Amino acid sequence: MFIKPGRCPKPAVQEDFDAARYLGVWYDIQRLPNKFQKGECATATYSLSPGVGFSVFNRERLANGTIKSVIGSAIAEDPCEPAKLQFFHENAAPVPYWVLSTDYDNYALVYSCINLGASHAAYASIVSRQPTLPEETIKKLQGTMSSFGVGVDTLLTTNQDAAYCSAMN
Amino acid sequence: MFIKPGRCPKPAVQEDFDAARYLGVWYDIQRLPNKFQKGECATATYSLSPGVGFSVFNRERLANGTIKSVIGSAIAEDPCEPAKLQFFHENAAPVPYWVLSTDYDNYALVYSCINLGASHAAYASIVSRQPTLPEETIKKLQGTMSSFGVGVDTLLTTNQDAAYCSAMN
Amino acid sequence: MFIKPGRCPKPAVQEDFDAARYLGVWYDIQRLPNKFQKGECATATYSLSPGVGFSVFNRERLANGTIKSVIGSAIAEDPCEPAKLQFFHENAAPVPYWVLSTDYDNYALVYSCINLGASHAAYASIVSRQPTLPEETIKKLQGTMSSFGVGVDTLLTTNQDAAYCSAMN
Amino acid sequence: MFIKPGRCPKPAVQEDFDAARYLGVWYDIQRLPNKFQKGECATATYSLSPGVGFSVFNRERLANGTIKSVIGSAIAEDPCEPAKLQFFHENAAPVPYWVLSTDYDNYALVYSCINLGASHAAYASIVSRQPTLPEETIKKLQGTMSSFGVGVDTLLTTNQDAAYCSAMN
Ligand SMILES: C=CC1=C(C)/C(=C/c2[nH]c(/C=C3N=C(/C=C4\NC(=O)C(C)=C4C=C)C(C)=C\3CCC(=O)O)c(CCC(=O)O)c2C)NC1=O
Ligand SMILES: C=CC1=C(C)/C(=C/c2[nH]c(/C=C3N=C(/C=C4\NC(=O)C(C)=C4C=C)C(C)=C\3CCC(=O)O)c(CCC(=O)O)c2C)NC1=O
Ligand SMILES: C=CC1=C(C)/C(=C/c2[nH]c(/C=C3N=C(/C=C4\NC(=O)C(C)=C4C=C)C(C)=C\3CCC(=O)O)c(CCC(=O)O)c2C)NC1=O
Numbered sequence: 001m002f003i004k005p006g007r008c009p010k011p012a013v014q015e016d017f018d019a020a021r022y023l024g025v026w027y028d029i030q031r032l033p034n035k036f037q038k039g040e041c042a043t044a045t046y047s048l049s050p051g052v053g054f055s056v057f058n059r060e061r062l063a064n065g066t067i068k069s070v071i072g073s074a075i076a077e078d079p080c081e082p083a084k085l086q087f088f089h090e091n092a093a094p095v096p097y098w099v100l101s102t103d104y105d106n107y108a109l110v111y112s113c114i115n116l117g118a119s120h121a122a123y124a125s126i127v128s129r130q131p132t133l134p135e136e137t138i139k140k141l142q143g144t145m146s147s148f149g150v151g152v153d154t155l156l157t158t159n160q161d162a163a164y165c166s167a168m169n
Numbered sequence: 170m171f172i173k174p175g176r177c178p179k180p181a182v183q184e185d186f187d188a189a190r191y192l193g194v195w196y197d198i199q200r201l202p203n204k205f206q207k208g209e210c211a212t213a214t215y216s217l218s219p220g221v222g223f224s225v226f227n228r229e230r231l232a233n234g235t236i237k238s239v240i241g242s243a244i245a246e247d248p249c250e251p252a253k254l255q256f257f258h259e260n261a262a263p264v265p266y267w268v269l270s271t272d273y274d275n276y277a278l279v280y281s282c283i284n285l286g287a288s289h290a291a292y293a294s295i296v297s298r299q300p301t302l303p304e305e306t307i308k309k310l311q312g313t314m315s316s317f318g319v320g321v322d323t324l325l326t327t328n329q330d331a332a333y334c335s336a337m338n
Numbered sequence: 339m340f341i342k343p344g345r346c347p348k349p350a351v352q353e354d355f356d357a358a359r360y361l362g363v364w365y366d367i368q369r370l371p372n373k374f375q376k377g378e379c380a381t382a383t384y385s386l387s388p389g390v391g392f393s394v395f396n397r398e399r400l401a402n403g404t405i406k407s408v409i410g411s412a413i414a415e416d417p418c419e420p421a422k423l424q425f426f427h428e429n430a431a432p433v434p435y436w437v438l439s440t441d442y443d444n445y446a447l448v449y450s451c452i453n454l455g456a457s458h459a460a461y462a463s464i465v466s467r468q469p470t471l472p473e474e475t476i477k478k479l480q481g482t483m484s485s486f487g488v489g490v491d492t493l494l495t496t497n498q499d500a501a502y503c504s505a506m507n
Numbered sequence: 508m509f510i511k512p513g514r515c516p517k518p519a520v521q522e523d524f525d526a527a528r529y530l531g532v533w534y535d536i537q538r539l540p541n542k543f544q545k546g547e548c549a550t551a552t553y554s555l556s557p558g559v560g561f562s563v564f565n566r567e568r569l570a571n572g573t574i575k576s577v578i579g580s581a582i583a584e585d586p587c588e589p590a591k592l593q594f595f596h597e598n599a600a601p602v603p604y605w606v607l608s609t610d611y612d613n614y615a616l617v618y619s620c621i622n623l624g625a626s627h628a629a630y631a632s633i634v635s636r637q638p639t640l641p642e643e644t645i646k647k648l649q650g651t652m653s654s655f656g657v658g659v660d661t662l663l664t665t666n667q668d669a670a671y672c673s674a675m676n
């Protein structure tokens with residue numbers, strides 16, 4: 001199910017989060033089933049913004065081979081909680097985006113949850129600075145997710161194959 | 170699906186909504202599939218509150234024959250929009266509850282929607298002051314729902330059979 | 339003034355806050371200057387409600403001798419943070435109400451703050467189960483307030499004189 | 508004062524608001540007394556952003572001759588209400604910004620309001636594509652404001668004198 005029992009959890013986020021080091025390209029390695037990703041090879045690119053926060057450009061490769069993308073803006077509405085962001089994507093209502101853990105140069109774990117009464121809808125992603133990530137790191141991040149009730153066996157492994165994804169350039 | 174494409178619609182609500190005439194017992198006649206109703210024979214009872222708004226007591230009959238209930242509070246956070254309520258149920262995050270149409274003495278149409286990025290999760294109910302409602306009224310209210318994109322063929326018809334539901338008293 | 343520089347602070351709230359023990363009558367002992375209290379002898383009475391949360395009845399004695407009162411409802415929108423309440427007063431927009439500290443039987447310190455861009459508007463009150471409170475307790479609670487930036491120097495001392503407030507009954 | 512009785516009004520906003528035509532430089536002509544503008548010669552510059560919405564750069568000239576400025580991002584959280592924006596200024600909490608009326612090439616009237624219980628704090632500004640605006644336009648826009656309860660009598664007339672504001676360049 002996309003909708004799960006219980007209200008949203010409140011996991012810990014990355015201490016001393018530094019958005020400048022978080023900028024650049026991230027590859028989707030695993031993610032919870034969701035409605036927005038329609039393809040494979042997903043990347044997120046975060047870039048400087050003349051205003052506050054940073055800009056967002058997400059791209060994926062659809063089955064027909066076309067590259068589909070969305071633009072957005074990311075802002076931490078409380079400057080004292082810089083890892084707790086609101087993402088504003090074109091044609092979407094705002095969604096939360098929490099950086100739960102990152103070392104900036106290899107991996108990040110991101111989490112988002114919206115309450116639906118006594119249920120909730122959550123999204124989570126393990127991302128990497130490369131199209132792959134070591135199994136040891138994946139299992140560690142999955143452990144973090146399990147610790148607050150995420151169904152890790154539901155995680156999808158994103159296709160990042162070099163040939164299949166060549167159209168991403 | 171419980172989660173549907175598009176952001177929440179903004180249907181018109183009942184003009185000149187009068188919560189005092191809305192109080193009392195309502196029977197669930199049809200509703201969109203949802204996660205909270207686990208049984209049949211559902212009723213909603215709205216009662217006076219010493220504070221602002223009104224109090225909520227929802228009851229249903231589970232398959233095992235036990236009656237399960239929840240208490241809540243209903244408040245219109247903007248007094249100038251009295252038909253646009255927030256419902257606060259025990260152990261639940263707040264949810265919207267809009268009275269789209271009612272004649273107070275026979276039927277009401279209620280709607281609730283929460284945005285999930287570019288998707289949404291909606292709930293809707295046709296309720297009656299009696300365990301049944303005339304087909305003509307049902308079709309009229311379904312027409313209202315269709316006019317803003319609700320999938321009316323997905324509506325569930327609640328079992329309100331006198332014998333099956335006798336445990337509701 | 340009423341609006342001061344900086345965003346609202348997030349002070350710690352009462353651990354294991356038990357609303358049931360918080361019910362009953364409280365006397366205003368000191369409070370920050372505000373727009374709603376126009377007289378003296380202020381009291382807050384919190385009572386059981388059939389729904390969630392509790393009901394609110396605040397009364398004060400105006401300079402002309404008239405007793406003025408308001409009703410409201412109090413609800414903790416996040417059940418896991420029971421001391422962080424939203425108060426809904428008749429014809430008012432919702433306002434936050436945080437129980438920072440209480441021993442239920444003698445005193446409580448309440449705090450509320452709303453952001454106004456790079457400024458904020460804050461309210462705070464020391465209340466007592468009696469019309470007076472020990473000077474030692476008061477100094478203790480003022481210490482808490484000044485610890486997160488409240489200007490305790492601006493606190494008003496509420497007239498609770500038994501003769502002046504006799505109209506309160 | 509800055510805080511006045513009653514909840515925020517909901518004035519009508521500019522129909523078919525086109526952010527692209529709203530970009531560029533605006534001069535503050537009149538504004539309600541507020542906490543953020545500490546000088547004169549105020550200007551707002553709105554620019555393209557790679558993400559959603561637009562970027563904000565506000566500048567003014569303090570009495571000591573120093574130019575003070577702030578950066579921010581503007582986003583319409585509901586794409587169907589493009590004139591109802593949220594402004595995120597550096598180190599400030601989010602604030603509403605509603606374009607009530609503009610012809611893009613000459614004037615705009617902006618409004619913002621935040622509820623404080625049964626009171627409110629409002630901001631409003633008349634801006635112009637030039638350092639001055641025709642008296643007729645000004646009276647027109649004041650009429651709009653007074654029509655929903657703004658105290659136009661309290662409006663400050665911003666010093667845009669070319670010599671006094673020369674440091675703005
Ligand atoms: C996103 C929207 C959304 C809404 C609107 C919603 C309402 C809501 N209905 C609830 C229970 C309930 N609600 C009902 C019945 C009704 N409820 C009604 O709103 C009406 C009109 C009827 C009947 C006429 C009953 C019978 C229960 C108790 C369910 C049970 O405990 O078995 C609960 C309690 C939590 C739970 O048991 O899951 C919530 C939060 N929840 C949501 O996520
Ligand atoms: C309830 C939570 C919730 C979240 C978090 C959410 C994010 C989000 N991701 C989007 C697109 C996208 N998002 C991604 C990828 C990513 N996105 C990421 O947050 C990360 C970490 C990656 C990859 C590493 C891509 C590739 C698209 C474009 C999808 C497409 O247009 O095909 C959109 C655009 C609207 C849409 O296309 O449906 C939203 C709102 N939506 C939600 O409802
Ligand atoms: C920004 C924060 C903020 C808060 C917290 C707030 C509370 C609040 N207190 C109110 C009335 C009142 N409140 C009080 C007293 C109390 N109230 C208390 O919270 C406590 C602890 C006491 C006393 C112990 C009384 C006596 C009234 C009625 C005042 C009157 O009608 O004369 C009202 C009614 C609207 C009004 O008359 O202005 C609100 C919204 N308003 C705000 O804007």
Ligand SMILES: C=CC1=C(C)/C(=C/c2[nH]c(/C=C3N=C(/C=C4\NC(=O)C(C)=C4C=C)C(C)=C\3CCC(=O)O)c(CCC(=O)O)c2C)NC1=O
Pocket residue numbers: 454455456457533534535542543544545546549550551565566567575576577596599600602603604617619620621628629630632634
């Ligand atoms: C409750 C409502 C509310 C609003 C709208 C608001 C806007 C706002 N304007 C700001 C600065 C500023 N805003 C302006 C000017 C403008 N600003 C405008 O919205 C327009 C139309 C002009 C001029 C045409 C300038 C010049 C600064 C920098 C002030 C300075 O740093 O000295 C800031 C920075 C924080 C601060 O310095 O206080 C905020 C939050 N703040 C609020 O509390």
